Design a protein around this nucleic acid. Structure first.
Ligand SMILES: [K+]
Ligand SMILES: [K+]
Ligand SMILES: [K+]
Ligand SMILES: [K+]
Ligand SMILES: [K+]
Ligand SMILES: [K+]
Ligand SMILES: [K+]
Ligand SMILES: [K+]
Ligand SMILES: [K+]
Ligand SMILES: [K+]
Ligand SMILES: [K+]
Ligand SMILES: [K+]
Ligand SMILES: [Mg+2]
Ligand SMILES: [Mg+2]
Ligand SMILES: [Mg+2]
Ligand SMILES: [Mg+2]
Ligand SMILES: [Mg+2]
Ligand SMILES: [Mg+2]
Ligand SMILES: [Mg+2]
Ligand SMILES: [Mg+2]
Ligand SMILES: [Mg+2]
Ligand SMILES: [Mg+2]
Ligand SMILES: [Mg+2]
Ligand SMILES: [Mg+2]
Ligand SMILES: [Mg+2]
Ligand SMILES: [Mg+2]
Ligand SMILES: [Mg+2]
Ligand SMILES: [Mg+2]
Ligand SMILES: [Mg+2]
Ligand SMILES: [Mg+2]
Ligand SMILES: [Mg+2]
Ligand SMILES: [Mg+2]
Ligand SMILES: [Mg+2]
Ligand SMILES: [Mg+2]
Ligand SMILES: [Mg+2]
Lengths: 66, 177, 215, 177
RNA sequence: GCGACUGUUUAUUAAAAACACAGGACUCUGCUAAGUGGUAACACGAUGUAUAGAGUCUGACACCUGCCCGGUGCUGGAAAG
RNA sequence: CGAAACCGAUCGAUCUAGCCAUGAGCAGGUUGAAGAGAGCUCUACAGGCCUUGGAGGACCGAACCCACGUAUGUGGCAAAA
RNA sequence: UCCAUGGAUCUCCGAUCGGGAAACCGUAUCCAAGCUCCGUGGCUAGUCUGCGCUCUUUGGACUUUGAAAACUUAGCGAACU
C-alpha cells in the first residue's frame, strides 16, 4: 500500500515541490508529516499549496525571467 | 446496553433540561453514540469500533473445546495534529490507524467522522475541540510581502535583536555592579 | 551505641521478609533478623569536588564499608510596510463553508457548552499553526482576522512573523487533556558539606578524594 | 586550614597520577590500559551499579574506540561500556569478608535467614522430589535431572529460552563493535 | 548402634535414628539480573550488584571420595538433506 | 427415604502456622574466653606465673515455656484433666 | 372526643460539608448589590459626607442524585446428570 502526498519543497529522490508523489505510509506518517515536508493529497491542502506557491513563485518568476 | 440513554442523561444534566426544545432533543438523540462498548480501556482510546471477543479453542484430533479470547491490535502512538502543531499520544488500533491514513490525518478524521461513530465521550470532546479550532481558523487571512519588504523587515529584526542583546547585557552587568 | 550514624543521612525502612504487595511469600527463607536503619550514600558522584576523608564506618545494609567525607571545593521607527503582494484566506480548511455566530440553539452549541470551561485562542498556548503557511515557508507573513469592511494595509514590525529555519514542541495526551483544560485543577565558618561514599581499599582518614569532570 | 590542603594536593599532583589516586572518581574515557577500577556506571549520570561488593574490582582492557571501553568484570565476562560513564579507582574495601565463617545456627538467624527444607524430604503434593518409602530421590533410570520446586531443571547448564535469546542478541550486538 | 552438638515436629494414641543446623560441592544470573506471584500494570528479589541473588544434594571434625556419557534428562555445533 | 462427591458465589488468621510494628519478662548460685596490668626471662619483640576482667545457642536451679514415664479418670472435675 | 381542609413546631443514622468503632465529633461558605439600628473620623458646622461588622432581603460561585422485587437489553459463563 502507498500514499499520495504533495511536496512542499525539493526532496532529492522524490521530486520538485508542488508535485504529488507516492510514498510509504511509515515514511509519510513519521517523517514528512511532522516536518511539514509533505501534505496529504486531499482537496483543501492541494488548493492551499497551489495558491501559496502561485503567489510566491509569481515573484520568483518575475525575478528570474527578466 | 442503553449507552445512548446514559450519555444523554449526563449531557442533559450538564446543560440544563430547560435549555433544549423538543426538536433539539430529537436531534441530540441522533448524535449521542449508541454502540456496544463494555471493556474499560476502549473508552480511553481510539479503537474505531474494535472490541474483544471470547470464543472456543478446539483441539485437532479430540475436538476438545476450551475458552479463549481475541484482542484488538492496540498500539500506543503519537499522531501529529495540524492545528495544535504538536503530537497527540493515543492508544489506537491498526484499523483506526488505517482509517486515519485514508482520511488524511487525525484532525481530518475527527472532522469527517460523525458524532455517532465517535463511540466515546472523549471522542465527542476531541471532535468538538478540533471543530471549534477549525471554525476559529476559518475567519483568518494572511498577507505576504515583496522581497524588498523581506529585506527591510529582516534588517529591522536584526537591529532589534542586537539592541535587545546589548541592553540585556548592560542590565546584567549593572545589576552585577 | 558507640557511633550513631549522622542524623542527616539516616532513613528508616521496614522489613519485607520476602512478601510482595499482595502479602504472599515470593522469596523464600527470609525474615526475623535484627533491626537496621538505612544509610543514604552518594552513588552518583557527578559534582566535581575535593574532599578530606573524616572517618570509615560500618554499614549493616551492605557488605562493604562507607566513608564520611567533608568537601572543601565546590524605540525606533519600525519598517511599516503598506504593500501586500497577495492575500490568502483560510475559508476551505474547515471543510464546510458556513456563517459566523455572534438565535436557535444548535447541536454544535450544545456540544460546546457541554464540554466548555467550568467558567482569539490562536496565541499563548499553541500559537499560529505552521500549516497555514505551507506553500512557501520562508516568507514573512502577517495573520489577521477577516473583516466585513476592507481593512488597512499598515503593518508594523511587531505584527510580522517568520518561522526562521530552526523550525522546519510538547505533546498532548488523549485522556488527560480535559483535566489540564479545566484550569489545571561557600557557607559560613560553622558549616561543612559532608557526604557518604563507598570506601575503597587502603583509604583511611586524612586522605584526599577527587571527583573529576570531562575536559 | 583548607587552602593549605589544596596546596598540598597540588604539590603531590606532580608525584601522583590518575592511577595512584585511590578512591577518586573520573569518567572512563580519561583512564588508561590496565587500570583497576570499581563502581562502574552503566548509563552516564545514573549511579554506580556494576562492581560494588566487598573486595571486588574490574579491569580496563581496551582504550576508547568509538567512545566505548572494554572492561573485564568480576564474573569474568567482558563488556563494552560507554566512555562517559564514571568509575572509581581501586578495590572495594573489606576484602576479607568472603573468608570469615560462622559456627552456629543462630548466626544465620541474626541475618534474617530462615531454615530451608530439602525437596527430597517432602510429599508429592509439595515437591517433584518428594514421595517414596525410605531415603529416595523420586526419579530413576528413566526420570529427569534435579529440579526446582516449580519443575525447571537446575543442573547441567540449563537456562530458559528467554535468557538464551537475550544473551545471544547481546553477544551478536557486541561482536560488531 | 544411630544422630556431631543447643534446637524443631504429627494441637487430641508415634518426640525418634525423622526435620533443621554451622560446614562442603554443582548449575544459572552483567542488572529493566536470574528466580517467584499475577491477564496486565506492578511488587518481592533490593534503595542489593558475582566476596551478591536463586535452585539442588550432602550434613560438625579427621582421612578419603575409584571406573562408566551406552540409557533418561540438560547442553554446544559450519553446512547439505 | 439414603450417600461419598462435582461446580458457582461469598464468610472466616479472636483457635492455630509464618511474618510486621510497638511494649514487657527472666529469684538465686557457679564456671572463668578474649582483652588489660606488677615481680621472672629474651638482643629486644615474644613466652611462662600472678592480678584484673566477665564471654558463652556455658553449668545447677524457681517464676515462665514444654509434655518424657507411671498411676488415676474413661457419660470423667475435664469432647484431652 | 371525633371528621374534612389548611397551617405552626418538626432530634439522629442510613447520607451526600469534612472525619468515623452507623445512630457520634468538628463546622459563621463566598461575593457583589440596598436598607433600619450600632461606633469612629473629619469639616469652613449644617436636612454635611466616609469607613467598618452583625443580621436581613435578591441574585450568582462550588457540588448533593439516590437507592428499590420481578420483567427488558447486554457482558462473562459452569458442573453434577
Ligand atoms: K536443608
Ligand atoms: K497444603
Ligand atoms: K523423596
Ligand atoms: K521419604
Ligand atoms: K512415606
Ligand atoms: K558421620
Ligand atoms: K526429646
Ligand atoms: K520432623
Ligand atoms: K551414561
Ligand atoms: K548421556
Ligand atoms: K556470667
Ligand atoms: K461433562
Ligand atoms: Mg546449607
Ligand atoms: Mg515425610
Ligand atoms: Mg505449596
Ligand atoms: Mg508432581
Ligand atoms: Mg530403600
Ligand atoms: Mg532402583
Ligand atoms: Mg547389633
Ligand atoms: Mg540429635
Ligand atoms: Mg543443656
Ligand atoms: Mg534436645
Ligand atoms: Mg500426638
Ligand atoms: Mg507423646
Ligand atoms: Mg523493587
Ligand atoms: Mg541426610
Ligand atoms: Mg563417586
Ligand atoms: Mg473430579
Ligand atoms: Mg477476611
Ligand atoms: Mg485480624
Ligand atoms: Mg542472675
Ligand atoms: Mg544455657
Ligand atoms: Mg508442641
Ligand atoms: Mg456525614
Ligand atoms: Mg431500575
Amino acid at each position: 500500500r502507498k500514499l499520495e502526498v504533495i511536496l512542499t519543497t525539493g526532496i532529492e529522490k522524490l521530486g520538485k515541490g508542488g508535485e504529488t508523489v507516492k510514498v510509504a505510509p511509515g515514511y509519510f506518517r513519521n517523517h514528512l508529516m511532522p516536518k511539514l515536508l509533505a501534505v496529504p493529497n486531499i482537496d483543501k491542502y492541494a488548493h492551499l499549496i497551489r495558491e501559496q506557491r502561485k503567489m510566491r513563485n509569481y515573484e520568483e518568476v518575475k525575478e528570474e525571467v527578466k | 446496553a442503553f449507552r445512548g440513554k446514559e450519555m444523554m442523561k449526563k449531557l442533559v444534566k450538564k446543560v440544563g433540561a430547560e435549555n433544549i426544545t423538543p426538536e433539539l432533543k430529537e436531534k441530540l438523540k441522533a448524535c449521542v453514540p449508541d454502540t456496544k462498548v463494555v471493556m474499560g480501556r476502549a473508552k480511553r482510546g481510539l479503537y474505531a469500533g474494535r472490541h474483544i471477543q471470547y470464543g472456543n479453542r478446539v483441539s485437532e484430533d479430540g475436538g476438545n473445546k476450551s475458552r479463549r479470547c481475541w484482542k484488538p491490535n492496540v498500539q500506543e502512538k503519537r499522531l501529529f495534529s495540524y492545528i495544535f502543531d504538536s503530537h497527540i499520544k493515543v492508544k489506537v488500533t491498526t484499523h483506526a490507524l488505517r482509517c486515519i491514513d485514508k482520511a488524511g490525518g487525525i484532525d481530518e478524521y475527527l472532522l469527517k467522522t460523525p458524532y455517532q461513530k465517535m463511540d466515546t465521550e472523549m471522542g465527542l470532546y476531541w471532535k468538538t475541540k478540533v471543530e471549534a479550532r477549525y471554525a476559529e481558523l476559518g475567519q483568518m487571512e494572511v498577507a505576504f510581502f515583496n522581497p524588498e519588504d523581506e529585506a527591510k523587515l529582516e534588517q529591522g529584526f536584526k537591529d532589534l535583536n542586537i539592541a535587545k542583546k546589548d541592553a540585556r547585557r548592560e542590565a546584567r552587568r549593572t545589576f552585577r555592579k | 551505641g558507640r557511633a550513631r550514624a549522622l542524623r542527616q543521612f539516616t532513613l528508616s525502612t521496614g522489613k519485607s521478609a520476602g512478601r510482595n504487595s499482595s502479602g504472599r511469600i515470593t522469596v523464600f527463607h527470609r525474615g526475623g533478623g535484627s533491626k537496621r536503619l538505612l544509610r543514604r550514600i552518594d552513588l552518583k558522584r557527578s559534582t566535581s569536588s575535593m574532599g578530606i576523608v573524616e572517618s570509615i564506618e560500618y554499614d549493616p545494609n551492605r557488605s562493604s564499608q562507607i566513608a564520611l567525607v567533608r568537601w572543601i571545593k565546590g524605540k525606533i521607527l519600525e519598517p511599516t510596510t503598506n504593500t501586500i503582494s497577495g492575500l490568502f484566506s483560510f475559508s476551505f480548511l474547515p471543510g464546510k463553508v458556513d456563517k459566523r455566530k455572534v438565535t436557535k440553539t444548535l447541536v454544535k452549541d450544545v456540544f460546546f457548552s457541554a464540554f466548555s470551561s467550568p467558567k482569539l485562542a490562536f496565541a499563548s498556548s499553541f500559537d499560529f499553526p505552521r500549516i497555514p503557511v505551507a506553500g512557501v515557508s520562508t516568507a514573512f507573513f502577517a495573520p489577521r482576522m477577516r473583516q466585513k469592511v476592507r481593512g488597512k494595509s499598515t503593518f508594523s514590525l511587531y505584527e510580522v512573523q517568520k518561522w526562521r529555519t530552526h523550525s522546519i514542541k510538547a505533546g498532548l495526551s488523549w485522556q488527560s487533556f480535559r483535566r489540564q483544560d479545566t484550569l489545571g485543577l561557600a557557607c559560613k565558618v560553622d558549616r561543612a558539606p559532608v557526604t557518604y561514599i563507598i570506601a575503597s581499599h587502603q583509604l583511611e582518614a586524612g586522605k584526599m578524594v577527587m571527583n573529576c569532570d570531562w575536559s | 586550614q583548607n587552602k593549605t590542603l589544596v596546596a598540598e594536593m597540588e604539590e603531590k599532583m606532580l608525584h601522583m597520577d590518575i592511577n595512584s589516586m585511590i578512591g577518586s572518581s573520573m569518567p572512563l574515557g580519561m583512564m588508561r590500559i590496565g587500570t583497576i577500577i570499581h563502581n562502574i556506571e552503566m548509563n552516564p549520570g545514573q549511579g554506580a551499579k556494576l562492581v560494588r561488593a566487598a573486595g571486588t574490582n574490574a579491569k580496563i582492557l581496551k582504550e576508547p574506540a568509538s567512545g566505548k571501553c572494554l572492561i573485564k568484570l568480576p564474573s569474568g565476562d567482558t563488556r563494552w561500556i560507554n566512555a562517559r560513564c564514571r568509575a572509581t579507582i581501586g578495590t572495594v574495601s573489606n576484602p576479607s569478608h568472603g573468608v570469615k565463617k560462622l559456627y552456629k545456627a543462630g548466626q544465620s538467624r541474626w541475618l534474617g535467614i530462615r531454615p530451608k527444607v530439602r525437596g527430597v524430604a517432602m510429599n508429592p503434593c509439595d515437591h517433584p522430589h518428594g514421595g517414596g518409602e525410605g531415603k529416595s530421590k523420586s526419579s530413576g533410570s528413566r526420570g529427569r535431572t534435579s529440579v526446582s520446586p516449580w519443575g525447571k531443571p537446575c543442573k547441567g547448564g540449563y537456562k530458559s529460552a528467554s535468557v538464551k535469546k537475550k544473551k545471544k542478541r547481546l553477544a551478536a550486538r557486541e561482536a560488531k563493535m
